[PDB]
Amino acid sequence: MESLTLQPIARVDGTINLPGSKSVSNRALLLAALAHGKTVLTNLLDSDDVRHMLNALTALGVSYTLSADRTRCEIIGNGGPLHAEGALELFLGNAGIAMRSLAAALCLGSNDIVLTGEPRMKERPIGHLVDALRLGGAKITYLEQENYPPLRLQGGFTGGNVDVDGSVSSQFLTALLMTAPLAPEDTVIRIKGDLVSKPYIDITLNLMKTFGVEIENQHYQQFVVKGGQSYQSPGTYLVEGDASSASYFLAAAAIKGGTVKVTGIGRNSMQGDIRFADVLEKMGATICWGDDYISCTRGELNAIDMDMNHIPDAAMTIATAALFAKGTTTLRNIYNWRVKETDRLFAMATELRKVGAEVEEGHDYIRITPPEKLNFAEIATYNDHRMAMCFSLVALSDTPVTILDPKCTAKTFPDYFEQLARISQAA
Numbered sequence: 001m002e003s004l005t006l007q008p009i010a011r012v013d014g015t016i017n018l019p020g021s022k023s024v025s026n027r028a029l030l031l032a033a034l035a036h037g038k039t040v041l042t043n044l045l046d047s048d049d050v051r052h053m054l055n056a057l058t059a060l061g062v063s064y065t066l067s068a069d070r071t072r073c074e075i076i077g078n079g080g081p082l083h084a085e086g087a088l089e090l091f092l093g094n095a096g097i098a099m100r101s102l103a104a105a106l107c108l109g110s111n112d113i114v115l116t117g118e119p120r121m122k123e124r125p126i127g128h129l130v131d132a133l134r135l136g137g138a139k140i141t142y143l144e145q146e147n148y149p150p151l152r153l154q155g156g157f158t159g160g161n162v163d164v165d166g167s168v169s170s171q172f173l174t175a176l177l178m179t180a181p182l183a184p185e186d187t188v189i190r191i192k193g194d195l196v197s198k199p200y201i202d203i204t205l206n207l208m209k210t211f212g213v214e215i216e217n218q219h220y221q222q223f224v225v226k227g228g229q230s231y232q233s234p235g236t237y238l239v240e241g242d243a244s245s246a247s248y249f250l251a252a253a254a255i256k257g258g259t260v261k262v263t264g265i266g267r268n269s270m271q272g273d274i275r276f277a278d279v280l281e282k283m284g285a286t287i288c289w290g291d292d293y294i295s296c297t298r299g300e301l302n303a304i305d306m307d308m309n310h311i312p313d314a315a316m317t318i319a320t321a322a323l324f325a326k327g328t329t330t331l332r333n334i335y336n337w338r339v340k341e342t343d344r345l346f347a348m349a350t351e352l353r354k355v356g357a358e359v360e361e362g363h364d365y366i367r368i369t370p371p372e373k374l375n376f377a378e379i380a381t382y383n384d385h386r387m388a389m390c391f392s393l394v395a396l397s398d399t400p401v402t403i404l405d406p407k408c409t410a411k412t413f414p415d416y417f418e419q420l421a422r423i424s425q426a427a
């Protein structure tokens with residue numbers, strides 16, 4: 001199959017203008033499609049996940065135009081719930097937010113739509129969301145394995161008292177939050193117990209407000225939503241740079257800098273992954289914050305032991321950065337790595353061992369003891385963009401690394417390797 005071999009990188013230094021945030025991009029696209037008015041999104045991410053959402057909107061009848069680089073999108077709002085019948089199939093690749101958000105949104109009114117995706121998407125749980133949507137009146141059928149896509153949605157979500165489990169994915173709650181305002185009746189969303197990936201809920205609420213809707217958040221345990229609302233175009237909206245994509249470059253500087261500055265995100269960012277910079281600081285790197293940039297300068301790198309539930313994606317970056325740190329690193333409370341693009345705890349543990357680390361793959365944590373020196377490995381990427389980007393960092397050592405299926409990074413960052421190369425220096 002395809003592979004890319006990265007030669008050793010002696011030092012990293014420079015500036016990266018970040019691609020748009022995937023989390024913000026797909027939420028903004030769905031809200032813009034539901035809203036009244038024309039929304040112009042700028043700095044929109046062009047990646048597989050966004051392309052699947054755009055293809056879904058096209059299939060649903062939403063009109064929009066894209067600039068040549070596909071980063072500017074003018075969306076003609078539908079002015080209400082999107083509709084389609086005839087069991088129209090929407091293929092969503094392995095786009096989590098698109099699948100979860102559309103599964104909820106397309107339950108408004110009457111529809112007859114089927115949501116599906118790549119083989120792995122059919123292994124990513126959606127039962128907690130279906131349970132909540134049904135409590136609100138939705139008619140949903142599992143076409144294959146119970147609790148997983150594909151789903152046939154036949155509408156009927158009207159609102160009311162809805163319970164939702166927030167212990168496996170915050171995406172179910174996000175999906176319900178964006179949908180409930182348009183339901184005819186008021187909705188009270190009660191979180192059953194724990195809520196993981198909490199920062200992403202803040203991203204959802206931020207976008208909802210930008211599009212004219214607010215709800216009552218009672219300490220993240222209950223959300224009171226008024227029904228009969230309408231989303232309104234915010235005019236020209238700037239999509240923040242991707243803080244998860246930034247993690248690789250900031251980590252690269254913490255390991256082999258130099259100073260690397262990423263632009264497009266800053267201290268005011270709504271994304272929880274900007275907190276990744278705080279972890280690098282705890283490890284010994286120096287961080288500089290700006291209004292539209294975050295920079296990291298090499299200091300030292302010491303192992304850490306911390307709960308990473310608040311930054312599940314960027315936390316993967318710490319797992320490979322740990323290869324360069326002094327001591328044993330432990331990342332805890334990351335059980336849901338197991339139900340994402342691949343089972344990331346199994347994948348990360350497996351590939352880290354290939355380059356020489358001693359790794360304990362815990363049920364919901366990972367413990368990494370780096371080797372005195374890394375060795376060459378051909379890294380399997382599990383159709384997971386982040387496995388490829390995380391392991392690209394192995395090249396910040398004396399050894400090259402070969403990354404299988406490098407194009408899997410296109411899920412959220414098509415130009416990843418060219419960008420890493422941009423800050424890679426020989427001296």
Ligand SMILES: O=C(O)C1=C[C@@H](OP(=O)(O)O)[C@@H](O)[C@H](O)C1
Pocket residue numbers: 022023024096097168169170171174196197200312313336340
């Ligand atoms: O809401 C979002 O944009 C996301 C939330 C996270 O999922 P979980 O809530 O399942 O942890 C994250 O891993 C995913 O890449 C994007």
